[PDB]
């Protein structure tokens with residue numbers, strides 16, 4: 001593993017600790033989220049981010065942060081503000097960017 005892979009594995013571990021229920025662990029299915037795939041053009045989740053680190057697809061911390069923000073933005077687009085998913089997406093977006101400095 002490269003220096004960037006080691007750092008992103010560290011960041012991903014610290015970000016997933018902020019989602020103890022695993023709401024963001026795996027891709028959102030149309031089965032659990034009616035019409036999700038037709039509303040959200042660029043789905044993202046922590047599991048896909050792990051796969052991209054292992055595949056060495058992140059060539060900068062900037063690219064990794066953009067996928068984390070995408071995941072949070074998707075949840076805040078699809079879910080109404082009064083929902084568990086919206087509130088956790090907003091919480092971990094801010095806390096996550098602070099953690100990564």
Ligand SMILES: Cc1c(NCc2ccccc2-c2ccccc2)cnn(C)c1=O
Pocket residue numbers: 021022023024026027028029032033036074075078079085
């Ligand atoms: C962020 C988000 C959702 N997250 C939950 C989820 C999504 C995919 C797989 C599994 C779960 C899950 C469900 C319950 C408990 C643990 C994991 C679900 N729906 N939508 C629309 C989302 O944005």
